[PDB]
Design a protein around this ligand. Structure first.
Ligand SMILES: [Mg+2]
Ligand SMILES: [Mg+2]
Ligand SMILES: [Mg+2]
Ligand SMILES: [Mg+2]
Ligand SMILES: [Mg+2]
Ligand SMILES: [Mg+2]
Ligand SMILES: [Mg+2]
Ligand SMILES: [Mg+2]
Ligand SMILES: [Mg+2]
Ligand SMILES: [Mg+2]
Ligand SMILES: [Mg+2]
Ligand SMILES: [Mg+2]
Ligand SMILES: [Zn+2]
Lengths: 136, 71, 38, 141, 94, 131
RNA sequence: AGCCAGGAUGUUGGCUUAGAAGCAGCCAUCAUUUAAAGAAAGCGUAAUAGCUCACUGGUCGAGUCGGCCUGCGCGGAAGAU
């Protein structure tokens, strides 16, 4: 599971997730999954979708993961009242906006990568599409 | 493939020996024996044949021992 | 008959039919493949 | 031409009649006789070679009698006694098993070309050599 | 060769350009050379079919605006975040 | 049948043999067998070779294209599945009648040896041939 | 789309082993005849065998097969007087 090796601070505010995305292109491989919805992607969903698409192409070709879960999420333990500080860090997410390319491939036929990206997209909570490389 | 030719030569007898024994309908009355033949493969046939070959060759070797005055 | 929220053709002989406001699949080869959306 | 009724084109290396478990169970449970291969098989085998697998027809009728006809050895087993290699393919692109002279095959093509189709002998050469190339054999100029 | 028909924009800005794209058009501009830049509008669906080819970006292509021919090249392209649509095209006149 | 280029390149391969041929007979072998059809096609190689263009293009505008050149009386070839077999060596060679001998060799549909008409003949068994 | 016909040739393959012979999984996929036929897409077998499909002929003879952008509807949808 992807996770920062070392961090400056242990916890982060909640924040918001407004706006569109930077990184809306296929700049490494030939095909990719572009996100159409907005939300969070955890480290267990990124890892589960990478296993599904690696196992679909029989490890022929290259795969680029193009997002990283760098934001910590905390939860209070069970049956405690409010307050008394902040919770404990439980997992890490990546914030997703309409337009991000999440994965890449190169070195497979265009027809086989659509099937591989279809099995991958069934593991994520965000609606995605299939995109190709452009000249400009 | 250093000694795969011996494996193929062993293949080239049970490749048609097995037919009259798979459907002979004497070893199928009990449930276990049919799948025993299917999975445990072809042990009895080729092992008995190779035993007969060993017996023939050992019979050959035993002879030609009572002779003198020659190297 | 399998009653699942997503019904798909599983073999070459499966057919989609809408009968009385219900989507359902029928095929002539494997009766295991008949299925309706419920 | 007559349709296949109960018969197949295959048997063990024809080297001897050997009406034994190597040959009989192919059709013994189908009727007729098994030990009939004792004299019926070396009649045509005594002069060809001792160890060549050649298919024969086993056309059998309800009269508990069967007619059999011999033929040329198949393509793969042919490239064993004169090709100088007793192995086969399994990774043609990974490696070459060895060298083979092309002039060898068309010298023995008309051995197999008697029933083999083709416009002429040279046409058969590419067919017989192509599956030879699949074995990893290097076609020597 | 590729030939594009365009019209000169009558108003500009955030609101004016959002109205063009709701009517199936989009803005572009021709700059470079010696003259002043020229802001135009041009049909979306037609120029979408043209630019799917790979020689749209490596060829001199004419734009017929006000009835007169000018030879230009495609310098930049600005496309929708996730939909298959265009938003703006930069032309450099040749 | 492929696209228009093949509608034009297969027909032009026909004109090679019909230009310098002889009396030809037509056979309608719709229901044969390829292993049996192999012998009929492999019989061609035995006499002189595969020099006969034995293609089948019996569509309305797939074989009639060459009719105005030669075999004008073959313009009535509109009926269904047929075959084309011609003769280079000798006028009215055995191929006009060897199919009649081959008719009994499981050739039930044989078009009744009507053939093409160079001297304006009819349906007859012209068995005469100088040997 | 129907309705008829063909739908072939040495690969019982060597490759994994008795079996993978088109059809469980391991390399390859040439060549021949042909209007056409894939060293097999499916069913079905223990290997079999067979039945289809691609491709090509024949009658009919007028359109036909899929994606993309969108508006409104369908299923998914079970609680207690
Ligand atoms: Mg803020
Ligand atoms: Mg806000
Ligand atoms: Mg933002
Ligand atoms: Mg941001
Ligand atoms: Mg992010
Ligand atoms: Mg009802
Ligand atoms: Mg402004
Ligand atoms: Mg302003
Ligand atoms: Mg505003
Ligand atoms: Mg609804
Ligand atoms: Mg709904
Ligand atoms: Mg109530
Ligand atoms: Zn079905």
């Amino acid at each position: 599971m992807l996770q920062p090796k070392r961090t400056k601070f242990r916890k982060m505010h909640k924040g918001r997730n407004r706006g569109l995305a930077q990184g809306t292109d296929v700049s490494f491989g030939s095909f990719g999954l572009k996100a159409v919805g907005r939300g969070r992607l955890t480290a267990r969903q990124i890892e589960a979708a990478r296993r599904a698409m690696t196992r679909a192409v029989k490890r022929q070709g290259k795969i680029w993961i193009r997002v990283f879960p760098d934001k910590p999420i905390t939860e209070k333990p069970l049956a405690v009242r409010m307050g008394k500080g902040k919770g404990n860090v439980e997992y890490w997410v990546a914030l997703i906006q309409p337009g991000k390319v999440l994965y890449e491939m190169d070195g497979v036929p265009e027809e086989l990568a659509r099937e591989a990206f279809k099995l991958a997209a069934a593991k994520l909570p965000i609606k995605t599409t299939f995109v190709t490389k452009t000249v400009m | 493939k250093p000694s795969i030719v011996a494996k193929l030569e062993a293949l080239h007898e049970r490749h048609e020996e097995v037919q009259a024994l798979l459907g002979d309908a004497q070893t199928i009355a009990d449930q276990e024996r049919f799948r025993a033949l299917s999975r445990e493969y072809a042990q009895l046939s080729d092992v008995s044949r190779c035993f007969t070959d060993w017996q023939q060759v050992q019979e050959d070797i035993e002879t030609a021992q009572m002779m003198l005055d020659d190297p | 008959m399998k009653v699942r929220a997503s019904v798909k053709k599983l073999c070459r002989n499966c057919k989609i039919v809408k009968r009385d406001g219900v989507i359902r699949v029928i095929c002539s080869a494997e009766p295991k493949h008949k299925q309706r959306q419920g | 031409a007559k349709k296949v009724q109960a018969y197949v084109k295959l048997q063990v290396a024809a080297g001897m009649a050997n009406p034994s478990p190597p040959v009989g169970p192919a059709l013994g449970q189908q009727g007729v006789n098994i030990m009939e291969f004792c004299k019926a098989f070396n009649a045509k085998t005594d002069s060809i070679e001792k160890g060549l697998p050649i298919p024969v027809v086993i056309t059998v009728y309800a009269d508990r009698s069967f007619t059999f006809v011999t033929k040329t050895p198949p393509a793969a087993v042919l490239l064993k006694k004169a090709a100088g290699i007793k192995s086969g393919s399994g990774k043609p692109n990974k490696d070459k098993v060895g060298k083979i002279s092309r002039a060898q095959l068309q010298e023995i093509a008309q051995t197999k070309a008697a029933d083999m189709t083709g416009a002429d002998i040279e046409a058969m050469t590419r067919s017989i050599e192509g599956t030879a190339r699949s074995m990893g054999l290097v076609v020597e100029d | 060769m590729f030939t594009i028909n365009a019209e000169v924009r009558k108003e500009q800005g955030k609101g004016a350009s959002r109205r063009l794209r709701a009517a199936n058009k989009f803005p572009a501009i021709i700059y470079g050379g010696k003259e002043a830049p020229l802001a135009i509008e041009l049909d979306h669906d037609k120029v979408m079919n043209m630019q799917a080819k790979a020689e749209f970006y490596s060829e001199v292509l004419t734009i017929v605006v006000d009835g007169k021919e000018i030879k230009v090249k495609a310098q930049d392209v600005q496309r929708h975040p996730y939909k298959p649509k265009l938003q703006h095209i930069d032309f450099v006149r040749a | 049948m492929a696209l228009n280029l093949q509608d034009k390149q297969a027909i032009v391969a026909e004109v090679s043999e019909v230009a310098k041929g002889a009396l030809s007979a037509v056979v309608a072998d719709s229901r044969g067998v390829t292993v049996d059809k192999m012998t009929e096609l492999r019989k061609a190689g035995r006499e002189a070779g595969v020099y006969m263009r034995v293609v089948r293009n019996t569509l309305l505008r797939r074989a009639v294209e060459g009719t105005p050149f030669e075999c004008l009386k073959d313009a009535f070839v509109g009926p269904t599945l047929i075959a084309y077999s011609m003769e280079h060596p000798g006028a009215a060679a055995r191929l006009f009648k060897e199919f009649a001998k081959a008719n009994a060799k499981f050739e039930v549909k044989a078009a009744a040896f009507e053939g093409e008409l160079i001297p304006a003949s009819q349906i007859d068994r012209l068995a005469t041939l100088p040997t």
